[PDB]
Write a protein that holds these residues in place. Structure first.
Motif, mmCIF file in Angstrom:
data_model
loop_
_atom_site.group_PDB
_atom_site.id
_atom_site.type_symbol
_atom_site.label_atom_id
_atom_site.label_comp_id
_atom_site.label_asym_id
_atom_site.label_seq_id
_atom_site.Cartn_x
_atom_site.Cartn_y
_atom_site.Cartn_z
ATOM 1 N N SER A 6 0.827 -1.201 0.000
ATOM 2 C CA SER A 6 0.000 0.000 0.000
ATOM 3 C C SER A 6 0.865 1.256 0.000
ATOM 4 N N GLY A 7 0.408 2.283 -0.709
ATOM 5 C CA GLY A 7 1.151 3.528 -0.778
ATOM 6 C C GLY A 7 1.891 3.688 -2.090
ATOM 7 N N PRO A 8 2.008 4.940 -2.559
ATOM 8 C CA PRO A 8 2.696 5.255 -3.816
ATOM 9 C C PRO A 8 4.203 5.044 -3.720
ATOM 10 N N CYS A 11 8.972 9.701 -4.238
ATOM 11 C CA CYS A 11 8.765 10.893 -5.052
ATOM 12 C C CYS A 11 10.097 11.489 -5.493
ATOM 13 N N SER A 33 1.929 6.153 -9.690
ATOM 14 C CA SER A 33 0.874 5.687 -8.796
ATOM 15 C C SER A 33 -0.376 5.307 -9.583
ATOM 16 N N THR A 36 -3.800 3.859 -5.592
ATOM 17 C CA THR A 36 -4.292 5.040 -4.896
ATOM 18 C C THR A 36 -3.721 6.315 -5.506
ATOM 19 N N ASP A 37 -4.547 7.354 -5.575
ATOM 20 C CA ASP A 37 -4.123 8.631 -6.135
ATOM 21 C C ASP A 37 -3.694 9.593 -5.030
ATOM 22 N N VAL A 38 -2.858 10.564 -5.388
ATOM 23 C CA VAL A 38 -2.373 11.546 -4.429
ATOM 24 C C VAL A 38 -3.447 12.582 -4.112
ATOM 25 N N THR A 39 -3.598 12.896 -2.829
ATOM 26 C CA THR A 39 -4.590 13.870 -2.394
ATOM 27 C C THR A 39 -4.034 15.289 -2.459
ATOM 28 N N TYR A 41 -0.010 17.794 -1.798
ATOM 29 C CA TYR A 41 1.448 17.803 -1.816
ATOM 30 C C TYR A 41 1.999 18.784 -0.788
ATOM 31 N N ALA A 80 4.380 12.959 -1.230
ATOM 32 C CA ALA A 80 3.047 12.676 -1.750
ATOM 33 C C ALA A 80 2.158 12.059 -0.676
ATOM 34 N N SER A 82 -1.320 10.244 0.487
ATOM 35 C CA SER A 82 -2.377 9.389 -0.039
ATOM 36 C C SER A 82 -3.506 9.234 0.976
#
Length: 106
Positions: A6-8, A11, A33, A36-39, A41, A80, A82
């Motif tokens: 889990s997790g991107p 970076c 990614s 899950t997409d980044v919410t 920064y 980043a 998530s």
């Protein structure tokens, strides 16, 4: 954790462009990614690496910094965030502003 990653991914470091003796622009991007997409920064910028805090926060990808000092080292780190947990930070990008010996155009 126990089963399933889990997790991107890490970076990459942004690009600093000394706009002026007291100016510095930064630019980052989103890692590979798919899940899950980044919410948002969270970008941190401080005088020295040891000292750094949240300077700008948002879904933005490009940010310009101002009000700096000439002949002074600086550092910046972008991470980043998530929905499952905040990911790791990027390679601290060090940069030193040019000396302001005399007049200036702007």
């Amino acid at each position: 954790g126990s089963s399933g990653s889990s997790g991107p991914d890490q970076c990459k470091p942004p690009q600093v462009t000394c706009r002026s003796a007291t100016c510095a622009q930064v630019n980052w991007e989103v890692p590979l990614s798919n899940g899950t997409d980044v919410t948002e920064y969270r970008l941190e910028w401080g005088g020295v690496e040891g000292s750094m805090q949240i300077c700008y926060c948002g879904p933005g990808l490009s940010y310009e910094i101002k009000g700096l000092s000439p002949a002074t080292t600086y550092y910046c780190r972008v991470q980043a965030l998530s929905v499952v947990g905040a990911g790791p930070f990027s390679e601290v990008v060090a940069c030193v502003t040019p000396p302001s010996s005399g007049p200036s155009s702007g």
